[PDB]
Amino acid sequence: MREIVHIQGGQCGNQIGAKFWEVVSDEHGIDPTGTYHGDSDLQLERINVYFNEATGGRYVPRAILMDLEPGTMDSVRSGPYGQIFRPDNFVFGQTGAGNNWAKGHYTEGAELIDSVLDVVRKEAESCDCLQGFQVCHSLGGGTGSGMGTLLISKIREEYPDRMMLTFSVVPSPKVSDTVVEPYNATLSVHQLVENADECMVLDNEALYDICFRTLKLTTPTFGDLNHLISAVMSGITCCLRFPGQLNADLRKLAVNLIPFPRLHFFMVGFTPLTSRGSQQYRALTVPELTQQMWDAKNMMCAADPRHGRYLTASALFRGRMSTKEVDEQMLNVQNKNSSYFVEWIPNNVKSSVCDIPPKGLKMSATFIGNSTAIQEMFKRVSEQFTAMFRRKAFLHWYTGEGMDEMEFTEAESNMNDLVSEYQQYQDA
Amino acid sequence: MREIVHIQGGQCGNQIGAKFWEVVSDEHGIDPTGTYHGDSDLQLERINVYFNEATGGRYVPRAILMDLEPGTMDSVRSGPYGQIFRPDNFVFGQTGAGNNWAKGHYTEGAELIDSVLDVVRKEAESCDCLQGFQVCHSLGGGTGSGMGTLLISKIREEYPDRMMLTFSVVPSPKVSDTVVEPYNATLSVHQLVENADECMVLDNEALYDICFRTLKLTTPTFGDLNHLISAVMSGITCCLRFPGQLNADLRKLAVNLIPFPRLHFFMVGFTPLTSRGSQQYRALTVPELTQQMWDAKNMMCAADPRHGRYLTASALFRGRMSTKEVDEQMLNVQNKNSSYFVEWIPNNVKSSVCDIPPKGLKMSATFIGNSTAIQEMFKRVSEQFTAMFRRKAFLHWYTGEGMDEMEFTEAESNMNDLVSEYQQYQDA
Amino acid sequence: MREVISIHIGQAGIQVGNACWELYCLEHGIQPDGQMPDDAFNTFFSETGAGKHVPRCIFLDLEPTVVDEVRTGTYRQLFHPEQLISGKEDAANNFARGHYTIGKEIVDLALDRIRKLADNCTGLQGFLVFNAVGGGTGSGLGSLLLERLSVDYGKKSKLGFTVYPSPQVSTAVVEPYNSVLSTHSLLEHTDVAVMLDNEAIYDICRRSLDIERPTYTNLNRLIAQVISSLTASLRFDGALNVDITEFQTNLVPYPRIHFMLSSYAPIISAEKAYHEQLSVAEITNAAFEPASMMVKCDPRHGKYMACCLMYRGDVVPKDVNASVATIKTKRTIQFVDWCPTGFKCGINYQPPTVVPGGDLAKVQRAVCMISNSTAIGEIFSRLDHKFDLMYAKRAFVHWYVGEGMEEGEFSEAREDLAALEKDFEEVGAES
Amino acid sequence: MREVISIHIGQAGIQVGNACWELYCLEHGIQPDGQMPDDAFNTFFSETGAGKHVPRCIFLDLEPTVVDEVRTGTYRQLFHPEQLISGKEDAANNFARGHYTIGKEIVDLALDRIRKLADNCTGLQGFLVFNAVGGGTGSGLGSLLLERLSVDYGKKSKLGFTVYPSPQVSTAVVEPYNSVLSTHSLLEHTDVAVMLDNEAIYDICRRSLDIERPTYTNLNRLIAQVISSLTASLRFDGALNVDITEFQTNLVPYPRIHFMLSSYAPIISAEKAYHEQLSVAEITNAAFEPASMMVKCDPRHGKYMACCLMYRGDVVPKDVNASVATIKTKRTIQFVDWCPTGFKCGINYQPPTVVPGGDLAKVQRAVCMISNSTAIGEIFSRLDHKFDLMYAKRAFVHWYVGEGMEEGEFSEAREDLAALEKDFEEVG
Amino acid sequence: SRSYPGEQVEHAFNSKRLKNWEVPAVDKSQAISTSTGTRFGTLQPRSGRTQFIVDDNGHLKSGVPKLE
Ligand SMILES: Nc1nc2c(ncn2[C@@H]2O[C@H](COP(=O)(O)OP(=O)(O)OP(=O)(O)O)[C@@H](O)[C@H]2O)c(=O)[nH]1
Ligand SMILES: Nc1nc2c(ncn2[C@@H]2O[C@H](COP(=O)(O)OP(=O)(O)OP(=O)(O)O)[C@@H](O)[C@H]2O)c(=O)[nH]1
Ligand SMILES: Nc1nc2c(ncn2[C@@H]2O[C@H](COP(=O)(O)OP(=O)(O)O)[C@@H](O)[C@H]2O)c(=O)[nH]1
Ligand SMILES: Nc1nc2c(ncn2[C@@H]2O[C@H](COP(=O)(O)OP(=O)(O)O)[C@@H](O)[C@H]2O)c(=O)[nH]1
Ligand SMILES: [Mg+2]
Ligand SMILES: [Mg+2]
Numbered sequence A, B: 001m002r003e004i005v006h007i008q009g010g011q012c013g014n015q016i017g018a019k020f021w022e023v024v025s026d027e028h029g030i031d032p033t034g035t036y037h038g039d040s041d042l043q044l045e046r047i048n049v050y051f052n053e054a055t056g057g058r059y060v061p062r063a064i065l066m067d068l069e070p071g072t073m074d075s076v077r078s079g080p081y082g083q084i085f086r087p088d089n090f091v092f093g094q095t096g097a098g099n100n101w102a103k104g105h106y107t108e109g110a111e112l113i114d115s116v117l118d119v120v121r122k123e124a125e126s127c128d129c130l131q132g133f134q135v136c137h138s139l140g141g142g143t144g145s146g147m148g149t150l151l152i153s154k155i156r157e158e159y160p161d162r163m164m165l166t167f168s169v170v171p172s173p174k175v176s177d178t179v180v181e182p183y184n185a186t187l188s189v190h191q192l193v194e195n196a197d198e199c200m201v202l203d204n205e206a207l208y209d210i211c212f213r214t215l216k217l218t219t220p221t222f223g224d225l226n227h228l229i230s231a232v233m234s235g236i237t238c239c240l241r242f243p244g245q246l247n248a249d250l251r252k253l254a255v256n257l258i259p260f261p262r263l264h265f266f267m268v269g270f271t272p273l274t275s276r277g278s279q280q281y282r283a284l285t286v287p288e289l290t291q292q293m294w295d296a297k298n299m300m301c302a303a304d305p306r307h308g309r310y311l312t313a314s315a316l317f318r319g320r321m322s323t324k325e326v327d328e329q330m331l332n333v334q335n336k337n338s339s340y341f342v343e344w345i346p347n348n349v350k351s352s353v354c355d356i357p358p359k360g361l362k363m364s365a366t367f368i369g370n371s372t373a374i375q376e377m378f379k380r381v382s383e384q385f386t387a388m389f390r391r392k393a394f395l396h397w398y399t400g401e402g403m404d405e406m407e408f409t410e411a412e413s414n415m416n417d418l419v420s421e422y423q424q425y426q427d428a
Numbered sequence C: 001m002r003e004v005i006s007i008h009i010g011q012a013g014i015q016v017g018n019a020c021w022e023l024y025c026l027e028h029g030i031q032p033d034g035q036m037p038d039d040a041f042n043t044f045f046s047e048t049g050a051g052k053h054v055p056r057c058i059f060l061d062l063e064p065t066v067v068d069e070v071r072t073g074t075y076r077q078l079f080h081p082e083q084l085i086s087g088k089e090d091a092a093n094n095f096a097r098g099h100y101t102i103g104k105e106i107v108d109l110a111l112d113r114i115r116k117l118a119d120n121c122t123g124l125q126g127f128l129v130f131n132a133v134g135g136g137t138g139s140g141l142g143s144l145l146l147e148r149l150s151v152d153y154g155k156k157s158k159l160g161f162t163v164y165p166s167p168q169v170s171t172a173v174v175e176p177y178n179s180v181l182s183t184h185s186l187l188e189h190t191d192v193a194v195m196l197d198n199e200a201i202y203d204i205c206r207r208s209l210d211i212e213r214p215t216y217t218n219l220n221r222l223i224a225q226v227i228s229s230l231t232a233s234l235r236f237d238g239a240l241n242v243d244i245t246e247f248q249t250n251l252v253p254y255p256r257i258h259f260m261l262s263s264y265a266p267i268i269s270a271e272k273a274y275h276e277q278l279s280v281a282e283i284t285n286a287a288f289e290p291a292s293m294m295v296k297c298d299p300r301h302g303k304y305m306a307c308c309l310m311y312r313g314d315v316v317p318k319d320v321n322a323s324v325a326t327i328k329t330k331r332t333i334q335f336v337d338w339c340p341t342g343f344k345c346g347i348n349y350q351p352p353t354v355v356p357g358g359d360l361a362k363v364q365r366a367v368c369m370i371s372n373s374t375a376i377g378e379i380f381s382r383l384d385h386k387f388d389l390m391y392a393k394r395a396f397v398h399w400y401v402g403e404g405m406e407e408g409e410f411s412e413a414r415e416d417l418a419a420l421e422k423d424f425e426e427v428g429a430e431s
Numbered sequence D: 001m002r003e004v005i006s007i008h009i010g011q012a013g014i015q016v017g018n019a020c021w022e023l024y025c026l027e028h029g030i031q032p033d034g035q036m037p038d039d040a041f042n043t044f045f046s047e048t049g050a051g052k053h054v055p056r057c058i059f060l061d062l063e064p065t066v067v068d069e070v071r072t073g074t075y076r077q078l079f080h081p082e083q084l085i086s087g088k089e090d091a092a093n094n095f096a097r098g099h100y101t102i103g104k105e106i107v108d109l110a111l112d113r114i115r116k117l118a119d120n121c122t123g124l125q126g127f128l129v130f131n132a133v134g135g136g137t138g139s140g141l142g143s144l145l146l147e148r149l150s151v152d153y154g155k156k157s158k159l160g161f162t163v164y165p166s167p168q169v170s171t172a173v174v175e176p177y178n179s180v181l182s183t184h185s186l187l188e189h190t191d192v193a194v195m196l197d198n199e200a201i202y203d204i205c206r207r208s209l210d211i212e213r214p215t216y217t218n219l220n221r222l223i224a225q226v227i228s229s230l231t232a233s234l235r236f237d238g239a240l241n242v243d244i245t246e247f248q249t250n251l252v253p254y255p256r257i258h259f260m261l262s263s264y265a266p267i268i269s270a271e272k273a274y275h276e277q278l279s280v281a282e283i284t285n286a287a288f289e290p291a292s293m294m295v296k297c298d299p300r301h302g303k304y305m306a307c308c309l310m311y312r313g314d315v316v317p318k319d320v321n322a323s324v325a326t327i328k329t330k331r332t333i334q335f336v337d338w339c340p341t342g343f344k345c346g347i348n349y350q351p352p353t354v355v356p357g358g359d360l361a362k363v364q365r366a367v368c369m370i371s372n373s374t375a376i377g378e379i380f381s382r383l384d385h386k387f388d389l390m391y392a393k394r395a396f397v398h399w400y401v402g403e404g405m406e407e408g409e410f411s412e413a414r415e416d417l418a419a420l421e422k423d424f425e426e427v428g
Numbered sequence E: 001s002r003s004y005p006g007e008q009v010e011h012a013f014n015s016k017r018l019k020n021w022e023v024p025a026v027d028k029s030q031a032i033s034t035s036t037g038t039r040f041g042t043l044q045p046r047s048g049r050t051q052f053i054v055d056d057n058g059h060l061k062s063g064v065p066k067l068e
Helices: A011-027 A071-078 A101-105 A108-124 A143-158 A181-195 A204-214 A222-234 A250-257 A286-293 A323-336 A375-389 A395-399 A406-425 B010-027 B071-076 B110-122 B143-158 B181-192 B204-214 B222-236 B250-255 B286-292 B325-336 B372-389 B406-424 C010-027 C064-072 C095-101 C103-119 C136-152 C175-186 C198-207 C217-235 C244-249 C270-274 C280-288 C317-329 C377-391 C397-402 C408-426 D010-027 D064-072 D095-101 D107-119 D137-152 D175-186 D198-207 D220-230 D245-249 D280-287 D317-329 D374-391 D408-426
Strands: A003-009 A051-053 A059-061 A063-066 A130-138 A163-169 A198-202 A268-271 A310-318 A349-354 A364-371 B003-009 B051-054 B058-061 B063-068 B090-093 B130-136 B163-166 B198-203 B265-271 B310-318 B352-354 B365-371 C003-008 C045-047 C053-055 C057-060 C124-132 C157-163 C192-196 C304-313 C343-348 C365-373 D003-009 D045-047 D053-055 D057-060 D124-132 D157-164 D192-197 D259-262 D304-313 D365-373 E058-060
Touching: A003 A011, A003 A108, A003 A143, A011 A063, A011 A071, A011 A130, A011 A143, A011 A222, A063 A108, A063 A143, A101 A108, A101 A143, A101 A181, A101 A395, A108 A143, A130 A143, A130 A250, A143 A163, A143 A181, A163 A181, A163 A250, A181 A375, A181 A406, A198 A204, A198 A250, A204 A222, A204 D317, A222 A268, A250 A310, A250 A349, A250 A364, A268 A286, A286 A310, A286 A323, A286 A364, A310 A323, A323 A349, A375 A406, B003 B010, B003 B143, B010 B063, B010 B071, B010 B130, B010 B143, B010 B222, B063 B071, B063 B110, B063 B143, B090 B110, B110 B143, B130 B143, B130 B250, B143 B163, B143 B181, B163 B250, B181 B372, B181 B406, B198 B204, B204 B222, B204 C317, B222 B265, B222 B310, B222 B365, B265 B372, B286 B310, B286 B325, B310 B325, B365 B372, B372 B406, C003 C010, C003 C103, C010 C057, C010 C064, C010 C124, C010 C136, C010 C217, C057 C103, C095 C103, C095 C136, C095 C175, C095 C397, C103 C136, C124 C136, C124 C244, C136 C157, C136 C175, C157 C244, C175 C377, C175 C408, C198 C217, C217 C304, C217 C343, C217 C365, C280 C304, C280 C317, C280 C365, C280 D107, C304 C317, C317 C343, C377 C408, C408 E058, D003 D010, D003 D107, D003 D137, D010 D057, D010 D064, D010 D124, D010 D137, D010 D220, D057 D107, D057 D137, D095 D137, D095 D175, D107 D137, D124 D137, D137 D157, D137 D175, D157 D175, D157 D220, D157 D245, D175 D374, D175 D408, D192 D198, D192 D374, D198 D220, D220 D304, D220 D365, D259 D374, D280 D304, D280 D317, D280 D365, D304 D317, D365 D374, D374 D408
Parallel strands: A003 A063, A003 A130, A130 A163, A163 A198, A310 A349, B003 B063, B003 B130, B063 B090, B130 B163, B163 B198, B198 B265, B310 B352, C003 C057, C003 C124, C124 C157, C157 C192, C304 C343, D003 D057, D003 D124, D124 D157, D157 D192, D192 D259
Antiparallel strands: A051 A059, A268 A364, A310 A364, B051 B058, B265 B365, B310 B365, C045 C053, C304 C365, D045 D053, D259 D365, D304 D365
């Protein structure tokens, strides 16, 4: 029951999809051959939320890899855990991506959708009770920003009642992985505002600082960044996969977070994060978990909470612990820095808990929060978009695909409506 | 009891029949020496539906191989399973056919009927209870199409109560193996509208699709495609040959299928089909059989059922299974995507089951669909006919055999009326 | 049961028959002395009481100087000497001599020999006629033979492979007359005609085989390869067998249009073979390439009306289909509108054979493409313009009028050729 | 699968073709005799049915004196003999002869080679054009060849690594003429055109490599290092994989501005490697150094409209984003306002390879920079001065108008430079 | 010659997947009257009496509007 299908579309999508399925596989004790080698029956009780049984007792992930130019797919197949995916669940086109939203959404998306959806349906029927969909996007690139939104639109029409979730990697404030990032951003955010129910924004800048200062790493590879992201993605469905003295389904998480249908851009963080030196010094207690999680540094996106107001927040704990302490810590926080919280919400946090920690750990905690400091990213993005669009740089590339300019102005107005909505409820 | 006499006309028919009798014979554990070497007593009970006893315990098939230019028979007469046939069931003419429907129907065919009919009768009376006929065709050439139909009209009048099937392979839409193909097609269709009870249509092109899109083959040969056609042909007479908790005779399969006497064109598909790598992941259950068969890819004909509506359908499952799942599955489909099924037929599927799966499997199925998308074969053929018949191209070859001209238009009008019957009943 | 009869008229007829038969004996293991150390040789041969395989061909000519080379060569134990037919005097590059004066004395024995040769046949498929238009013997005597054959058999199928008078490279001066005369004579009687030109095959030998000095024998090797590919499906197994009647029916649209081009691929040297891969897509693209046409016609000045392809060796039907679909999608290939179809494909499992001391390279895939395009209007226009330029002055006409003709035969032939080129124009025009 | 087509025109094109194709044969262990003692060589080769790897390049030229050397050099077993195209006589430093007289009867002969060279590619990225602007074959045949490509392919990506007439060092007197005529001909037909001068690479050989006896075989070895560093993502794994389609999109603001600069770092002798450490920050600093530019243009006189970076070797992504941030803090570097972004980046885990007998040093970090600066209007202007200088007396023109050109093509080609000159200022 | 839509098998029959990057010839598919006007639409029906416009030997017999 409560099955979940997983989508990764793009280079960044497909690469973090590798780490995510490696983290989950180690959680439930399955080898890259697909066989099971865990000990408890807890690994086998709710394996069906992500995997499908096979002959001889194998568990294949319920994932889809969609990406043009299968180069990165050939890599993840050559990876250690590339033997687990069904070769059927690969969708690729021989053409190039272009780092372009248009041809991702209009030309080559158009021919891949025929096969992507048939793959989606044939595995969504295997579910006895579909909970929702989750995707891994990257708003800079062309495939992710173009195929992903086209896929989400189709998904929302074919399954509107369910929950589609997004871990979108947004552009970075100072460094820019590509040059047409603003155009790729707005044209995707304009699609996200109508067709998304939950969308956590991540930024590589925030990931770099956490990996540099806190984790004290010296050569943070994208393998490590995705080990971070894979950790925080797994930390959401712990209530689904494992028992808990206060469990929290995915649906009730949104119900408590988003007060309005359009404010679904969250902000995440994981705890605990220590160096190899400080693992000896600092303890593992709930006050420790909550002190690091509320910090303005664990925010995996480059938004500053001290500038905005928290609409809602959420915490998910893992490890046999005392549920009075968590309720006390979250209340204590609200009373202390009360100005950062809205007043017409009495108690604006939810708190889950799971009796099952990560594999090698004993206490962990994961954070989600819907702040009004998220509007800053959209202001910075909207500013860069209008600066380039006022002169029509790189525009012949988009209009060469049957796009017009109303599709840009519509996108920019819809992003301007969103940033004003966030400004209203930010009463400073 | 329930005997069946089998015809193979033309080069194509003489080569599909090669694999067919290789498949069925192995299913009953008989050698190319014709001697039985199976194990169970189940093979011996209904062996007489296809074979006849002979001195020394040999079992010769109840087949008839007819063809002009017996060159292709010299192949099968020399193959591994070429020593089973009776040599008197080898009818051939010293001259050639020429991919010309006329002389394959009027001049040369007529000089062979006097001999062919003595062959069909002498082994239609050896049947204590004749069930029906079955033929294998090719609407492109002259022998299979021309002599095929001319043989039928002789059979239709001699044995009007018995049943006549035609596994006719029809032309391909995008690449034509012959140039005179549209002429030979309609002039044969004009015979099958009136002188046929059931007519399964197949396309060599859609067979290629299934061959490397599902089977993911590398070097498909006609020897492998015939290993597909022979799999569905063998999939029909299971209820005649093997016991089952819900049997389905060949006659009852038609009455449940064609509502009106003219719509006797179907489309077939086989299940399960996996690669050599996929059998490691995918499981073999009824929900798998029921989605791969209902998909719009296993349709061995080049007609997309999603461009039309299903009038009726069928399914012949094989293997000890739960007869509820089959009942509720075929029910669930008609309810989910109700747009593709007609309304004035509430329950438009028939479901049989046999306790004896294929020789090497544990569960299997077979599908027969009577959709209104079958008209697409007739639109595409109608234009290719009129584009060259209005110009009178390649036609002096047909009047060379004294053929008339209205025999072309009547053959065409008969089609362009059949293409409308398939549309009245398609209220979209 | 699958038997054909071969006729080599004129000099070039037997010049290419020698190559074809050195090919066939080697391909079927037949030693030059008739016998070898079923149903595989029966297409071209006949077995005597013990071991001897005599070929079912006829070599007809009027110069003893070549039939005697054949009689003295190593291939002298093969033929029944009554098959090798020669005359005392030659036609001397004169249609009138070949048709009215000389050939009418030996037609009687040629026909009774053809009768005796077709008697032993059980199932006769058709007559192959290797002719060389441009020389009196070839032209006139083939016209006379074809008229006699049409009145005798009629129902049988006549393929004629006619070495056609070439645009510029020409070893004659009167040939624009006898080419028109031969066409006007045989048009009503041949069932299909395959054109091929010494200049085009010279260019092929230059650009592909890297040979720079071909002495009329490399061209014959190439023609032998072509016929072997074309008649494989008669004596070799393989999917999609194709015989003569199937070949001609779906290829000749109107009673007039029965002349067609030819091509072959791959055709390479023993090192470019070893340094190339030759997939089926490359083979079909090279076949449909104009620079591979065995005749001096450019298909891009017209529109195809049908094509026939005979793949040999390691070929699969899906690959054939995909390559034909790619050709269709291509933009430089045109097709006259009234044929939405247009390809008759066949496969054979027997790869093309190679000859000792030859020049081609051992391959495993090969294609012999044969198409009927509306561009041979250009070669008919060339020939008619040359006949015109000459007959405007009554040049050389005294020879033809002395050797038993009159003037009206020139006007009949010229009007027939004008009508033929108007046909090739109209039947291609679209509404 | 990720395939390209490399074209070499003129003597320079072939003189670099020996350099690059000596590099790849070395970079994939390919012996000069074709074979070696997948998906790696398949970018530049075609594994025949047995052993040998044929390069997918084409050496086109008119003088036989260079292509015959390749036919006798050690790299003679490599090339398919029909790919190496050579004529009788050459264009003789004259744009007309390469465009109207001689070029017109060999293009289709090259096209048939390119035609059959594009079909064996299953996934094509784009054509690579090596040109020699300033001569007859390079400037004449090249421009005529591109137009024949633009009508045959149209949308495909054609790059141009066109060596360009140096300001001071010059081995021609008419090279101002056939350069102008080249641009106006390639301007509307190339997708993006890199520039590089023989003098700018001479000083690189003087300062850094410290070779005082430099020859062309010392320059062509520097160009192969660029492309090997540019097409690593096509054939080698590594984070931030980047293909060619995504290369022109975020780099060419307007359909006109596609003249770009190049760089490389490090460039050191064998011994100073034992005097350095080559940190990634130091590399990208020296990559933006004008002294490390491969064109004699000065970026510190203009502004940057875009930048593209290809890193290689031991590089991790945090430092690329760390050091680029620093360069954006420096003030010597400017950026036009309407592109706040501008840094497409790329990584590869395959360090650059060293050639036996070469002059570079074994290293583990490297950067290949490509930028679209507006200062490229300076090197453009001089060509418009020297052309206008000689054209006032119409010296040397009786040669151009002697080989099928008229006065139109001179003023026609002269105005476009004026139109392009103002275009390089309208962006400011 | 035309290319009629093979509906379920219409994918994998573009020029691209057939290794042809040469600006595909689409008029062979556009002369047809398919529903959506593209490769994936189904075509239309006819009455099917099919007059002649031509005598035995080609040569459009009447004043049929023809392109010279
Ligand atoms: N491909 C090929 N063509 C040949 C060969 N020998 C001659 N030809 C051509 O055939 C034409 C002449 O035909 P011939 O057979 O020699 O003349 P003829 O038909 O015997 O008439 P007469 O000479 O009067 O007896 C010339 O155009 C030759 O180029 C050959 O060996 N191979
Ligand atoms: N980087 C580099 N440039 C070269 C080389 N050889 C020549 N060049 C330059 O290329 C330009 C002319 O080279 P060519 O290829 O001979 O010119 P072309 O197109 O062949 O014209 P023609 O000589 O008339 O046939 C000059 O500016 C040369 O300095 C080389 O080996 N490497
Ligand atoms: N966590 C993580 N993010 C990446 C990685 N690679 C790329 N990204 C981001 O992916 C963004 C560009 O999208 P990309 O997937 O590379 O191109 P696309 O194929 O058009 O979607 C860039 O902003 C990169 O920062 C990676 O390896 N790990
Ligand atoms: N499945 C299958 N189809 C074939 C085979 N051979 C031919 N066909 C089809 O049969 C058609 C030609 O008809 P053909 O049998 O040669 O002419 P006939 O002798 O008059 O019946 C073509 O469309 C072929 O594609 C085969 O071996 N297997
Ligand atoms: Mg002669
Ligand atoms: Mg030069």
